[PDB]
Design an enzyme around this catalytic site. Sequence first.
Site: not given
Ligand SMILES: Cc1oc2ccc(-c3cc(N)nc(N)c3)cc2c1C
Length: 330
Positions: A41, A140
């Site tokens: 991220k 959320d």
């Molecule tokens: C495939 C995958 O694996 C993931 C692992 C963590 C997060 C993630 C996204 C956001 N906005 N916040 C967090 N804390 C984790 C997103 C993804 C995605 C998409």
Amino acid sequence: IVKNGEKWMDRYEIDSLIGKGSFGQVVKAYDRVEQEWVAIKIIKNKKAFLNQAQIEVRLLELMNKHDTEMKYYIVHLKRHFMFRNHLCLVFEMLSYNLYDLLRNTNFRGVSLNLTRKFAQQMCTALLFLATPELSIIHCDLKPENILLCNPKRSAIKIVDFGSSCQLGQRIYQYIQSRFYRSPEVLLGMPYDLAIDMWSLGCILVEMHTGEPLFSGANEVDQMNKIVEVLGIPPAHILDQAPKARKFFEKLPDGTWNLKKTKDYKPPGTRKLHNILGVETGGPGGRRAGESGHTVADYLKFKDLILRMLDYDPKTRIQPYYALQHSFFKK
Ligand SMILES: Cc1oc2ccc(-c3cc(N)nc(N)c3)cc2c1C
Ligand SMILES: [Cl-]
């Protein structure tokens, strides 16, 4: 902003973009040290996004040190670093999200049995966040923020602690995605962990019907769609609500009514029993005579949802008691 071969710090090789949001971007990357794929991220290089992501890192590290179990339905933060003045959060890789799963059903919904499996994992996650020394409000919850661990399996983890706060560390009055926003937040009232249980009730109906329970176009429409199903909120709540008069009007004898707009079903007459099709073969009758979709099964699900959608956040069912509900009994 990042090339699909770029190498960071002799550790990470960027593969591809797998997500984006207000916060920045999520990339798939190869970690040469752990020898595994990870999700990174990448937070925007702007103060507002940096400062809120630093709260997200703090809350995820707080969770990590509570290793005495029930923590395994939250996405695992592996580490974080600053790079090119971007805060970067490294997670395990997950699979696709529950909105994608609904899209894949043509928005017809998944079975009561798969809904139950999601409900039991999410209630366990909320039980973990309610541990006194965490007291973390997600703020959320929605299908997009719940990801499968593996495209072959029904394990899920919650992601996105970008809005999250500890009890007593509230920043924003206006929070939650509108469809999943609790009455206490629409009404501008101080909120606690119960708002996540409201969201979860909304989510579980949607996972089974294929469609959002309360699809408001704006806050006034949102509260009207809630009132269609659940009736006018109790007076004792409305009497304490800074935004009560956004939606309602008080009468002589301490009674409240909808503020009427220029031309909704009358209060409490859009019955959850008919949205679910308890006695009519399930949503749009599509589950008629399928195994695990009996009237008795449906009634337990309906009872549990109506406990999650209690107007009163003090009496709304809590995660431990949700896990003891007959919906989850074999
Ligand atoms: C495939 C995958 O694996 C993931 C692992 C963590 C997060 C993630 C996204 C956001 N906005 N916040 C967090 N804390 C984790 C997103 C993804 C995605 C998409
Ligand atoms: Cl009902």
